[PDB]
Structure formats: C-alpha cells, structure tokens
Amino acid sequence: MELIKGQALFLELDKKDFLSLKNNDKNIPTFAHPKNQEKILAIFSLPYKNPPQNTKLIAFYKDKKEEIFIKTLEGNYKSEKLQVENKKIFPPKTIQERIAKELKEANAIYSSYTPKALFNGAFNIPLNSFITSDFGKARTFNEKVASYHSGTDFRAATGTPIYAANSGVVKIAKDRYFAGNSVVIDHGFGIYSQYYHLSKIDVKVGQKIKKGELIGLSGASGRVSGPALHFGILAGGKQVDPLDFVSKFNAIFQL
Ligand SMILES: CC(=O)N[C@@H](Cc1ccc(S(N)(=O)=O)cc1)C(=O)N[C@H](C)C(=O)NO
Ligand SMILES: [Zn+2]
C-alpha cells in the first residue's frame, strides 16, 4: 500500500485467530469492524515531520504471520522555504515551564487509548463554513520541515458557535499557550478532535458530549493571526489531515 505523510489509513484484518498487530516493538490497537463480524480494524498514521521511507507491519495469528507493506508518499503540500535564518526562538523560563507542562499533559492524553467507541455515527464538520488555511502548510529550513499546520482553519468571526464533530469525552477545556482556548475530545480508540483559538469554552473536562452539541464560541486566542476556528484530528498517536480522516472514518461508520 501507499500513504501520504500526515495521513491516517484504516487497516482491515480477519478477526479470528488474530493475536496482535505490530510495528517494530509497538503494538497497534485494533477495534471491531462495525459492519462485518469477521473483521477487525486498525488505524495507522504517518507523522508529517520525519516519516520513514517505508513501513513493514506484522499481524501475528495463531498459526500464521502475515506482513503488510506501506510506502510513504510526499503529497503535494504547500511549502514555504526559509533561507534567511537568524534563528533563536526561546522564551522566558516560567513560560517554557508552561509550554512543557501543557505539552506533557497533552501527550498523556494523546498516548492514551480508550478501548471502546465513544462516537456515534459519522463525524460532522464543526461548523458550516469554508477553509482559509489547510492542513499540511509547511515552513522549511534546509529541506527539513521546521514546522507545519497541524489542523485546518475555518473562516469564523469571533463568537461563531462551534459544535462537536462527534460524541465523546472532553479531555481538555482551558486556555493553553499556543492553542489558546481549546477543547479536545476523546472519541475512543485514540481518536481525538481538537478545537482551538476559541473566544469561549462551554464544556468541562470529563463531560460527555454528543455529536452536534455546542462546545464553545470561535475566537482569536493563542498563536494565530486573527479569528478563525482551528480544527484538528489526532489518531494513531499522530496529528493527521482532518478532512481526509473524517472522510475515511465516515466511509466505514455511517449508520
Ligand atoms: C506546540 C505546537 O506545535 N503548536 C503548533 C501546532 C500545535 C497546536 C496544539 C498542539 S497540542 N494538542 O496542545 O500538543 C500541538 C501542536 C501551533 O502553533 N498551532 C497553531 C496554534 C495553529 O494551528 N494556528 O491556526
Ligand atoms: Zn490552524
């Protein structure tokens, strides 16, 4: 198979005699196929930054050991080189402490895997508006990706109501340094949706939330150039193309 870096892919495997799915040491979790009792699914994601050229996954069965090859594609992502440099980029120490703490909290959540589905049907778009900056937009320094856009921004005037893309459990609901007012929702199976730069948060950590339900109001908080809704998905432990993923997810999970 082939996959573009920064994308997720749904793997399908036989349910019976299946013991484990591995990439090197890493176990990859599995969940039931919703429409076929003899199948299981797994999600495999490539990082945007520093992917490997190729991936060899092994699915161990009682009497059998099948292999799976996935080649990394580049995609046609938007790319802006920086040759000028002059780089330093370090802030005060209690600000770095904030950045460090919020980062380790977020990884604790993103590492984690709820082994049941908290979602309900297909994902929705968090609001009915257009994209003003797509996932994958990169900044280059020396043929290396310095940074990239880890979600997709929708046009939204400050105060634009924002709805939950799917059901789940709210895991974050506070102002953070880079993301500003942010809500992160656990949908199960290590799938997290993200809603950043909000002007107002309408949910509490731990709170169960249904697809469609209001989560807050759009805003301009955090590292942004103006008011917009930043929408991201994390799955397979990686930030992935939000709209692509929604599209792949709904193909399996409608009804
Ligand atoms: C630490 C970092 O990498 N920040 C990046 C991406 C970013 C945001 C949030 C997070 S999390 N889930 O708290 O670890 C990681 C990475 C970033 O500046 N995103 C800005 C807010 C954006 O998207 N503007 O439209
Ligand atoms: Zn964004």
Short mmCIF file of C-alpha atoms and ligand atoms in Angstrom, two decimals:
data_model
loop_
_atom_site.label_atom_id
_atom_site.label_comp_id
_atom_site.label_asym_id
_atom_site.label_seq_id
_atom_site.Cartn_x
_atom_site.Cartn_y
_atom_site.Cartn_z
CA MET A 1 0.00 0.00 0.00
CA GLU A 2 0.87 3.69 -0.08
CA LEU A 3 0.07 6.57 2.29
CA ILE A 4 0.76 10.27 2.27
CA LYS A 5 2.63 11.55 5.31
CA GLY A 6 0.32 13.34 7.72
CA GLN A 7 -2.48 10.90 6.77
CA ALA A 8 -4.33 8.11 8.51
CA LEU A 9 -5.35 4.85 6.95
CA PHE A 10 -7.90 2.27 8.13
CA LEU A 11 -6.48 -1.30 8.01
CA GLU A 12 -8.84 -4.23 7.82
CA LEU A 13 -7.94 -7.70 9.15
CA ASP A 14 -9.56 -11.08 9.89
CA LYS A 15 -10.99 -11.27 13.38
CA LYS A 16 -10.41 -14.96 14.19
CA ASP A 17 -7.09 -16.45 15.36
CA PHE A 18 -5.78 -12.87 15.40
CA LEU A 19 -3.35 -12.22 18.24
CA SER A 20 -1.54 -8.98 17.59
CA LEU A 21 -0.55 -6.29 15.11
CA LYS A 22 2.93 -4.84 15.36
CA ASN A 23 5.26 -2.19 14.00
CA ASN A 24 8.70 -2.98 15.35
CA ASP A 25 8.09 -3.25 19.15
CA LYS A 26 4.87 -1.13 19.06
CA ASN A 27 1.61 -2.98 19.38
CA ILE A 28 -1.04 -1.26 17.28
CA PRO A 29 -4.53 -1.47 18.82
CA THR A 30 -7.47 -2.97 16.97
CA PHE A 31 -11.23 -2.49 17.20
CA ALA A 32 -14.23 -4.24 15.72
CA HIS A 33 -15.30 -3.63 12.14
CA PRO A 34 -18.82 -2.14 12.59
CA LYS A 35 -20.43 -3.95 9.65
CA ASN A 36 -18.63 -7.28 9.46
CA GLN A 37 -18.43 -9.64 12.42
CA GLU A 38 -15.37 -11.42 10.86
CA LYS A 39 -13.26 -8.27 10.57
CA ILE A 40 -11.24 -6.01 12.79
CA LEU A 41 -9.90 -2.57 12.01
CA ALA A 42 -6.72 -0.76 12.94
CA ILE A 43 -5.62 2.79 12.24
CA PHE A 44 -2.13 3.52 11.01
CA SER A 45 -0.87 7.09 10.71
CA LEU A 46 2.28 8.62 9.34
CA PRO A 47 3.87 11.64 11.02
CA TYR A 48 4.19 14.71 8.86
CA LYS A 49 7.62 15.52 10.26
CA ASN A 50 10.40 12.93 9.61
CA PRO A 51 8.40 9.99 8.38
CA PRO A 52 10.31 6.81 7.47
CA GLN A 53 10.56 5.88 3.78
CA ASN A 54 8.68 2.57 4.27
CA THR A 55 6.72 0.64 6.94
CA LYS A 56 6.53 -3.14 7.50
CA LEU A 57 3.70 -4.19 9.80
CA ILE A 58 3.23 -7.74 11.03
CA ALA A 59 -0.06 -9.25 12.05
CA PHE A 60 0.51 -12.31 14.23
CA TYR A 61 -2.08 -15.08 14.08
CA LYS A 62 -2.04 -18.41 16.00
CA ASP A 63 -0.72 -20.42 13.05
CA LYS A 64 0.32 -17.64 10.70
CA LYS A 65 2.29 -14.40 10.46
CA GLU A 66 1.12 -12.05 7.61
CA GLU A 67 3.12 -8.92 6.57
CA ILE A 68 1.87 -5.52 5.40
CA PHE A 69 3.96 -3.04 3.40
CA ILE A 70 3.11 0.67 3.38
CA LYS A 71 5.20 3.15 1.42
CA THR A 72 5.33 6.83 2.46
CA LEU A 73 4.27 9.35 -0.18
CA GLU A 74 5.13 13.06 -0.04
CA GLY A 75 1.82 14.53 -1.21
CA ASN A 76 1.53 17.97 -2.78
CA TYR A 77 1.58 20.02 0.42
CA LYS A 78 2.03 23.84 0.37
CA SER A 79 5.62 24.74 1.18
CA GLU A 80 7.45 27.96 2.00
CA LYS A 81 11.24 27.79 2.39
CA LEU A 82 13.19 29.92 4.89
CA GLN A 83 16.77 30.61 3.68
CA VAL A 84 17.28 33.88 5.61
CA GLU A 85 17.54 32.25 9.11
CA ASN A 86 18.65 34.42 12.08
CA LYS A 87 17.00 31.78 14.30
CA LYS A 88 16.97 31.85 18.13
CA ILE A 89 13.33 31.36 19.32
CA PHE A 90 13.44 30.81 23.14
CA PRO A 91 11.06 32.45 25.64
CA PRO A 92 11.25 33.10 29.46
CA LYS A 93 11.66 30.11 31.86
CA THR A 94 8.23 30.11 33.55
CA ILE A 95 6.76 30.42 30.02
CA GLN A 96 8.83 27.42 28.93
CA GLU A 97 7.57 25.64 32.04
CA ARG A 98 4.01 26.35 30.90
CA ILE A 99 4.79 25.16 27.42
CA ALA A 100 6.43 21.99 28.85
CA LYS A 101 3.61 21.20 31.24
CA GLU A 102 0.79 21.71 28.71
CA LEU A 103 2.74 19.54 26.21
CA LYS A 104 3.16 16.66 28.63
CA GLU A 105 -0.48 16.84 29.68
CA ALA A 106 -1.48 16.70 26.02
CA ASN A 107 0.79 13.75 25.26
CA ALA A 108 -0.55 11.87 28.28
CA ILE A 109 -3.98 12.20 26.74
CA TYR A 110 -2.88 11.51 23.14
CA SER A 111 -0.79 8.44 24.14
CA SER A 112 -3.84 7.04 25.82
CA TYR A 113 -6.28 4.58 24.17
CA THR A 114 -9.90 4.22 25.30
CA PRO A 115 -10.74 0.71 24.03
CA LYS A 116 -14.38 1.46 23.21
CA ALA A 117 -16.24 3.73 20.78
CA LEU A 118 -17.47 6.94 22.33
CA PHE A 119 -18.54 8.38 18.97
CA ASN A 120 -21.92 7.99 17.42
CA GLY A 121 -22.06 7.53 13.69
CA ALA A 122 -20.15 9.69 11.25
CA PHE A 123 -18.18 12.80 12.07
CA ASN A 124 -19.61 16.21 11.27
CA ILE A 125 -17.83 19.39 10.27
CA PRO A 126 -17.65 21.54 13.46
CA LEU A 127 -19.23 24.43 11.61
CA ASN A 128 -20.72 25.09 8.20
CA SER A 129 -18.06 27.37 6.71
CA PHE A 130 -15.07 27.22 4.32
CA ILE A 131 -11.34 26.55 4.78
CA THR A 132 -8.95 29.53 4.89
CA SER A 133 -5.78 27.55 5.62
CA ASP A 134 -5.38 23.86 5.03
CA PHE A 135 -3.59 21.17 6.90
CA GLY A 136 -0.03 20.49 5.81
CA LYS A 137 1.09 24.05 5.06
CA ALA A 138 4.81 23.93 5.93
CA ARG A 139 7.81 26.14 6.82
CA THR A 140 11.13 24.81 5.52
CA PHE A 141 14.62 25.43 6.86
CA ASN A 142 17.19 23.45 4.80
CA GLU A 143 14.98 20.82 3.12
CA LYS A 144 13.74 19.97 6.66
CA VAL A 145 10.20 20.74 7.82
CA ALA A 146 10.70 23.28 10.59
CA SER A 147 7.00 23.47 11.42
CA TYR A 148 3.65 22.76 9.84
CA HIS A 149 -0.04 23.47 10.17
CA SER A 150 -1.35 20.57 12.30
CA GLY A 151 -5.07 21.13 11.60
CA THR A 152 -7.40 23.08 9.29
CA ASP A 153 -8.73 26.56 9.81
CA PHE A 154 -12.30 27.54 9.01
CA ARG A 155 -13.37 31.17 8.49
CA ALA A 156 -15.16 32.26 11.64
CA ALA A 157 -15.87 35.65 13.01
CA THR A 158 -15.30 35.84 16.78
CA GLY A 159 -18.31 34.38 18.58
CA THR A 160 -19.22 31.90 15.83
CA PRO A 161 -20.88 28.88 17.56
CA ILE A 162 -18.89 25.69 17.38
CA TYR A 163 -20.28 22.20 17.50
CA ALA A 164 -18.84 18.85 18.44
CA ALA A 165 -17.73 16.91 15.38
CA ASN A 166 -18.71 13.65 17.12
CA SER A 167 -19.67 12.23 20.50
CA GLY A 168 -17.02 11.60 23.14
CA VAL A 169 -15.45 12.71 26.38
CA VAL A 170 -13.96 16.14 26.83
CA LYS A 171 -10.31 15.84 27.89
CA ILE A 172 -9.11 19.44 27.70
CA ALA A 173 -11.05 22.63 28.23
CA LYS A 174 -8.85 25.58 29.16
CA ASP A 175 -6.61 28.35 27.79
CA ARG A 176 -3.23 26.90 26.63
CA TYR A 177 -0.17 28.82 25.42
CA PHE A 178 -0.12 28.07 21.73
CA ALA A 179 -3.65 26.74 21.18
CA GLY A 180 -5.41 29.40 23.24
CA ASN A 181 -8.86 28.39 24.49
CA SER A 182 -9.02 24.79 23.48
CA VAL A 183 -11.30 21.81 23.70
CA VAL A 184 -10.01 18.32 22.98
CA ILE A 185 -12.48 15.39 22.82
CA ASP A 186 -11.80 11.67 23.16
CA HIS A 187 -13.90 9.73 20.67
CA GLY A 188 -12.49 6.36 21.64
CA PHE A 189 -9.80 4.23 20.05
CA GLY A 190 -7.28 7.03 20.39
CA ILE A 191 -9.18 9.39 18.09
CA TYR A 192 -9.17 12.99 19.31
CA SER A 193 -10.74 16.07 17.79
CA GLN A 194 -9.44 19.48 18.54
CA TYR A 195 -10.97 22.95 18.56
CA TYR A 196 -8.57 25.83 19.08
CA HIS A 197 -8.40 29.64 19.39
CA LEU A 198 -11.90 29.82 20.86
CA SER A 199 -13.28 33.00 22.46
CA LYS A 200 -15.33 30.90 24.92
CA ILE A 201 -15.45 27.32 26.29
CA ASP A 202 -18.86 25.74 27.00
CA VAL A 203 -17.73 22.38 28.35
CA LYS A 204 -15.94 20.83 31.31
CA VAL A 205 -13.13 18.29 31.46
CA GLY A 206 -14.71 14.86 31.95
CA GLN A 207 -18.04 15.93 30.47
CA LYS A 208 -19.69 13.62 27.99
CA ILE A 209 -20.70 15.39 24.82
CA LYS A 210 -22.95 14.33 21.91
CA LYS A 211 -22.23 14.95 18.25
CA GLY A 212 -23.72 18.31 17.26
CA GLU A 213 -23.67 19.63 20.80
CA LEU A 214 -22.30 23.17 21.30
CA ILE A 215 -18.75 23.30 22.63
CA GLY A 216 -17.90 26.98 22.58
CA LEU A 217 -17.51 30.07 20.50
CA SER A 218 -14.86 30.71 17.89
CA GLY A 219 -12.23 33.37 18.64
CA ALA A 220 -8.65 34.54 18.02
CA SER A 221 -6.96 33.23 21.20
CA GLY A 222 -3.41 31.84 21.01
CA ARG A 223 -0.89 31.58 18.18
CA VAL A 224 -2.98 32.86 15.27
CA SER A 225 -3.04 35.90 13.03
CA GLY A 226 -6.74 36.55 13.52
CA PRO A 227 -10.09 34.99 14.32
CA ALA A 228 -10.59 31.51 12.91
CA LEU A 229 -11.54 28.04 14.08
CA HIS A 230 -8.61 25.64 14.04
CA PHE A 231 -9.87 22.05 13.73
CA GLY A 232 -7.55 19.08 14.09
CA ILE A 233 -7.68 15.31 14.44
CA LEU A 234 -5.13 13.14 16.22
CA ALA A 235 -5.20 9.41 15.52
CA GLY A 236 -2.56 6.66 15.63
CA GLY A 237 -0.73 8.88 18.09
CA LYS A 238 -0.20 11.44 15.24
CA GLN A 239 -1.87 14.68 14.08
CA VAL A 240 -3.46 13.80 10.73
CA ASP A 241 -5.29 15.53 7.85
CA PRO A 242 -8.67 16.30 9.47
CA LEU A 243 -10.93 16.25 6.43
CA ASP A 244 -9.23 13.27 4.82
CA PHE A 245 -9.65 11.34 8.08
CA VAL A 246 -13.33 12.32 8.51
CA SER A 247 -13.87 11.09 5.01
CA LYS A 248 -12.15 7.75 5.65
CA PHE A 249 -13.88 7.35 9.02
CA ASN A 250 -17.43 8.02 7.69
CA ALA A 251 -16.94 5.56 4.81
CA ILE A 252 -16.80 2.83 7.48
CA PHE A 253 -19.04 4.23 10.26
CA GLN A 254 -22.18 5.74 8.71
CA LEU A 255 -25.48 4.47 10.25
C1 LIG B 1 3.38 23.31 20.14
C2 LIG B 1 2.93 23.33 18.68
O1 LIG B 1 3.35 22.51 17.95
N1 LIG B 1 1.98 24.33 18.18
C3 LIG B 1 1.53 24.35 16.77
C4 LIG B 1 0.61 23.16 16.45
C5 LIG B 1 0.00 22.54 17.71
C6 LIG B 1 -1.12 23.04 18.39
C7 LIG B 1 -1.55 22.38 19.54
C8 LIG B 1 -0.86 21.24 19.98
S1 LIG B 1 -1.29 20.26 21.45
N2 LIG B 1 -2.57 19.20 21.09
O2 LIG B 1 -1.66 21.18 22.78
O3 LIG B 1 0.06 19.36 21.80
C9 LIG B 1 0.24 20.78 19.28
C10 LIG B 1 0.67 21.42 18.15
C11 LIG B 1 0.77 25.66 16.51
O4 LIG B 1 1.31 26.70 16.69
N3 LIG B 1 -0.62 25.65 16.06
C12 LIG B 1 -1.28 26.91 15.86
C13 LIG B 1 -1.87 27.21 17.24
C14 LIG B 1 -2.40 26.83 14.81
O5 LIG B 1 -2.80 25.78 14.42
N4 LIG B 1 -2.98 28.07 14.31
O6 LIG B 1 -4.01 28.04 13.37
ZN ZN B 2 -4.72 26.06 12.31
#
